[PDB]
Amino acid sequence: MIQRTPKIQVYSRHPAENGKSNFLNCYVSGFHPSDIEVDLLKNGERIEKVEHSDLSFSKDWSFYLLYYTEFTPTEKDEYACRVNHVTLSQPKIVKWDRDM
Amino acid sequence: FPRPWLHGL
Amino acid sequence: MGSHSMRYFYTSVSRPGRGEPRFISVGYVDDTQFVRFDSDAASPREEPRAPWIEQEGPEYWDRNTQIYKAQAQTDRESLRNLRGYYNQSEAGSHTLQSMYGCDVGPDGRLLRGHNQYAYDGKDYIALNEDLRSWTAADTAAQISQRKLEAARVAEQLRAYLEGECVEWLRRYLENGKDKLERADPPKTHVTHHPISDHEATLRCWALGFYPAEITLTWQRDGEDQTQDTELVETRPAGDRTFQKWTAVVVPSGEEQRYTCHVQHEGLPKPLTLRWEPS
């Protein structure tokens, strides 16, 4: 009713190229209420220098936020976004796929 | 340029 | 085409036991955020969030800061009143959101104004498009409606929306212009991702575009397809621009029967794309 679970997309600013500096984005949207926790992860480990956008909302009143950090992808490093919200019984992890 | 506070609901 | 909007988005959230309700406000011109305020900042003040607004003088930042602080106080009263109208407990958290602003055409004249509210994420009360009357969701909102009518609030909103809203939006567009009046067309391509011996995904990409509004559609044999398609929400790249894709699952060997169709304000004419096995 008055609770909506976040949609999550994890993606780069630019097409990924191993060894070339880029930005990793975790875009969380469609959620209500507004309190939400998000971590960006490198091989399971929280990344410290992560920034986010100012809270805004869509036409249906659901909230959205962009979380982002500089990174340089490689063949083997795995990245992910971990999200908790009152609608989730445990945090949801979505892995970065460079083709989505 | 924002508007002022108005009146409460 | 050629139209523009200004919007302010306010969020007040109560947090019993953890202080007074938070107030946050962001302002946009089209899809470009230009200001913010957050009551939980160490020294709450309206702050610039685009380069072109930094030129405004101290009187602008001071006025607006004082506005938000007053609005925060007013929203806290509204939250109290709404809890009462709904017979709600003092123990829960509730949200009041507010959106207002104006839409203008190429000539700068008002096309329409907006001023509406949501409570716990549900429409509560809205200024009608006449800028004179209100629509209430339920018997609680009818109480607010009577109060707004009594205080003549629609009149004040109409004067702002026809007046300062449009006038300031025009000022932003005129000095802000290089970014705000510039549409950037999407860079487009189709990628191919085998799924099995029998099927492959075709993914039609749109990258680097502004503003956010775009339409991406897959046809088979020139007929719109929604079966076996997936269309992701338009997403921010972080550099003012947006991204989006749409994908379709096709029988392998039939890729050339599929076309992707792209429409965006930055495009002179719609694009049609096919996979090019390079």
Side-chain angles (χ1 to χ4, degrees):
Chain A
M1 155 87 154
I2 36 175
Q3 301 197 328
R4 291 122 104 179
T5 202
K7 288 181 301 250
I8 301 162
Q9 297 190 245
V10 187
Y11 56 103
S12 60
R13 177 175 305 176
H14 306 289
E17 287 227 303
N18 292 152
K20 303 267 185 65
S21 174
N22 203 325
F23 287 87
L24 182 60
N25 292 146
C26 184
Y27 179 59
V28 295
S29 65
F31 61 97
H32 216 289
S34 57
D35 274 356
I36 193 170
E37 300 176 70
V38 359
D39 288 315
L40 300 182
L41 307 179
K42 185 189 187 186
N43 306 308
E45 306 269 42
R46 178 170 186 276
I47 298 174
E48 187 165 25
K49 79 200 192 170
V50 169
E51 307 258 39
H52 60 82
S53 63
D54 302 322
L55 191 65
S56 197
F57 54 84
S58 299
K59 270 171 202 189
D60 62 10
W61 303 101
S62 67
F63 297 104
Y64 61 88
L65 290 168
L66 180 62
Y67 282 78
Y68 60 96
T69 187
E70 291 173 73
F71 81 135
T72 127
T74 55
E75 153 172 279
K76 6 70 109 174
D77 288 319
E78 291 188 50
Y79 291 87
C81 182
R82 177 176 62 211
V83 175
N84 211 341
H85 184 254
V86 68
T87 57
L88 304 171
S89 12
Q90 54 193 205
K92 178 176 263 155
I93 305 168
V94 179
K95 300 200 314 210
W96 177 52
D97 177 344
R98 73 181 51 208
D99 296 319
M100 293 192 302
Chain B
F1 189 84
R3 55 152 174 77
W5 56 272
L6 296 185
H7 185 95
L9 296 174
Chain C
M1 190 188 82
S3 88
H4 296 281
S5 64
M6 182 167 72
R7 287 292 186 273
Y8 282 91
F9 301 101
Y10 301 168
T11 306
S12 284
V13 185
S14 71
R15 44 178 169 192
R18 295 191 302 106
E20 292 298 326
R22 196 185 182 162
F23 180 85
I24 295 156
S25 63
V26 295
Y28 281 78
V29 171
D30 299 322
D31 292 321
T32 297
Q33 194 199 329
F34 70 102
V35 283
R36 68 175 182 199
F37 173 97
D38 180 356
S39 69
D40 281 350
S43 306
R45 287 206 52 82
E46 192 183 51
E47 294 181 322
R49 300 290 283 157
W52 42 272
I53 195 74
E54 293 173 13
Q55 319 145 37
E56 295 295 345
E59 176 176 310
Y60 175 92
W61 305 102
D62 286 345
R63 176 220 177 241
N64 300 344
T65 295
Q66 291 311 299
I67 289 168
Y68 300 131
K69 287 175 173 184
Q71 188 71 74
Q73 177 73 1
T74 295
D75 279 13
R76 293 175 182 170
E77 166 186 291
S78 297
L79 284 162
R80 285 186 303 270
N81 289 342
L82 263 68
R83 175 185 71 215
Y85 306 156
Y86 286 108
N87 308 303
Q88 291 163 339
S89 158
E90 300 189 23
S93 168
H94 298 279
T95 309
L96 177 59
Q97 288 160 274
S98 310
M99 176 279 275
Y100 66 87
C102 48
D103 304 331
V104 299
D107 64 359
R109 297 191 172 281
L110 182 68
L111 294 175
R112 94 154 280 192
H114 297 94
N115 191 90
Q116 58 187 129
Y117 304 92
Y119 186 58
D120 291 332
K122 299 189 109 59
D123 287 276
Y124 181 79
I125 196 172
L127 187 67
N128 289 153
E129 186 170 16
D130 60 11
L131 305 187
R132 288 176 51 105
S133 65
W134 301 90
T135 296
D138 65 11
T139 57
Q142 293 174 358
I143 302 180
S144 297
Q145 184 175 337
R146 162 174 61 68
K147 288 185 178 166
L148 291 171
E149 291 171 345
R152 291 297 152 99
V153 170
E155 281 168 81
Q156 301 172 328
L157 285 162
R158 182 178 168 186
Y160 168 77
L161 292 163
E162 299 191 315
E164 293 173 320
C165 192
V166 303
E167 286 151 6
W168 282 85
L169 173 57
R170 291 202 231 110
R171 182 188 169 92
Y172 301 147
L173 292 165
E174 291 174 332
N175 234 175
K177 191 182 217 167
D178 294 357
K179 296 117 300 198
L180 297 172
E181 289 282 10
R182 178 184 78 250
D184 294 323
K187 297 183 280 276
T188 57
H189 63 108
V190 177
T191 56
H192 184 266
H193 300 97
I195 292 161
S196 67
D197 297 337
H198 323 300
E199 295 181 316
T201 295
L202 292 182
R203 182 165 289 120
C204 179
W205 285 88
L207 301 170
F209 54 96
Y210 178 94
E213 176 67 36
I214 195 166
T215 299
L216 307 173
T217 52
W218 270 112
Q219 291 183 359
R220 184 190 159 85
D221 292 347
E223 161 161 56
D224 285 350
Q225 211 85 327
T226 59
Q227 183 174 261
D228 295 313
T229 64
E230 175 180 10
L231 178 61
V232 291
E233 184 189 343
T234 300
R235 66 196 195 189
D239 57 5
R240 92 157 195 158
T241 77
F242 298 86
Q243 311 183 340
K244 192 182 191 73
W245 58 253
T246 183
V248 64
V249 177
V250 311
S252 73
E254 299 186 14
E255 287 80 355
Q256 292 318 114
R257 298 174 65 183
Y258 288 84
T259 178
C260 178
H261 298 261
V262 187
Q263 297 160 261
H264 182 85
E265 188 182 9
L267 294 172
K269 49 179 300 274
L271 292 179
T272 130
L273 285 105
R274 261 194 267 75
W275 177 51
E276 249 91 311
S278 62

